[PDB]
Design a binder for this molecule. Structure first.
Ligand SMILES: O=C1NCCN(C2CC2)/C=C/N(CCO)c2ccn3ncc(c3n2)-c2cccc1c2
Ligand code: NA
Ligand code: NA
Length: 328
């Protein structure tokens, strides 16, 4: 049965919570336990109130995100298909209660400093259910790092990391992320010079440029195990396909074209579409501290441009990783 908030967030952990993000789904907090940061994603479920203007998910509707989070986290410990490029999942709980006053304090601080589009979550009763997902702390998103990266060599590493992670997940799980906008790519410092992955039993390395990438947010994702498909059926969603003002919103439409509006099917070309959108961001909206001036750096820039103009002719992240000249 459900547990109280105090089970996930004992007093000291709760006192250290700071809000780091939000969406219509709910709230994301950072806190510390055993000297280590973690991220806490809190989603109201099963109740009748609108939350942030939308109906709460049922438990049936939130299960896919839970399952996919666990499966992708487990890839860090596998053998034939291994990657650390998805965020680690520490724990998942179903909590019952009103929102903790200490989290409301954190919510208010964020509203005062950054501004919130959400409702202050102070209207929940003591029978309210929530899902609390505790993740590894993955760093800062690519959008927030728009003006923060060193050079296009860093952009190459990031694209390589993303492509390898998606490929491993394709091979293991027939995985499609389906919403890999630049808010869902996290970056954190690593002292490792090379990062390791294994794809269908073959191990390789990627130079890190001092950053480790984590892919997050599996709310629209799809995968399967033993022919049981887990996904989000958006075939009757209207709004998802009528965005404008960013290539992001074209990707939703291009996915629907690729899959004939049948979201249970496996179309790993959607991973290619998202990688193309991310490459487009690298070349058009990211701005680097050091521009390409040396021959070796000039070569890197031309290669990323070449990737941009060719990658749409590959069938999956796996095809890209294994056959594209960018990764040789
Ligand atoms: O689905 C998830 N969240 C989406 C919401 N998102 C909120 C909308 C901004 C990310 C918020 N931010 C701010 C980025 O700069 C972090 C920062 C560090 N970390 N470390 C792990 C997560 C996370 N989110 C995480 C893990 C799994 C799922 C989610 C988040
Ligand atoms: Na527990
Ligand atoms: Na620039």
């Amino acid at each position: 049965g459900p547990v109280p908030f105090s089970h996930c967030l004992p007093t000291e952990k709760l006192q250290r919570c700071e809000k780091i993000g939000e969406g219509v789904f709910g709230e994301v907090f950072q806190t510390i336990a055993d000297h280590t940061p973690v991220a806490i994603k809190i989603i109201a479920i099963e109740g009748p109130d609108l939350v942030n203007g939308s109906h709460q998910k049922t438990f049936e509707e939130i299960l896919p995100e839970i399952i996919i989070s666990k499966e992708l986290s487990l890839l860090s410990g596998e053998v034939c298909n291994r990657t650390e490029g998805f965020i680690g999942l520490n724990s998942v709980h179903c909590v019952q209660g009103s929102y903790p006053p200490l989290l409301l304090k954190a919510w208010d601080h964020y509203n005062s400093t950054k501004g919130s589009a959400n409702d202050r979550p102070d209207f929940f009763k003591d029978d309210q259910l929530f899902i609390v997902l505790e993740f590894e702390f993955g760093g800062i998103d690519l959008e927030q790092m728009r003006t923060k990266l060193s050079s296009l060599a860093t952009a190459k590493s990031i694209l390589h990391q993303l492509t390898a992670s998606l490929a491993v997940a394709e091979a293991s799980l027939r995985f499609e992320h389906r919403d890999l906008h630049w808010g869902n790519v996290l970056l954190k410092k690593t002292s490792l010079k090379k990062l390791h992955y294994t794809l269908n039993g073959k191990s390789s390395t990627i130079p890190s440029c001092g950053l480790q990438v984590s892919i997050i947010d599996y709310t629209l994702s799809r995968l399967e195990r033993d022919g049981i498909v887990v996904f989000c059926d958006v075939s009757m969603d209207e709004d998802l396909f009528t965005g404008d003002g960013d290539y992001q919103f074209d990707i939703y439409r291009l996915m629907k074209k690729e899959n004939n509006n049948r979201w249970g099917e496996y179309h790993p070309y959607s991973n290619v579409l998202w990688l193309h959108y991310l490459t487009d961001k690298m070349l058009k909206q990211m701005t680097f501290k050091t521009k390409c001036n040396t021959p070796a750096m000039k070569q890197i820039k031309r290669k990323i441009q070449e990737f941009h103009r060719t990658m749409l002719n590959f069938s999956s992240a796996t095809d890209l990783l294994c056959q594209h000249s960018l990764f040789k």
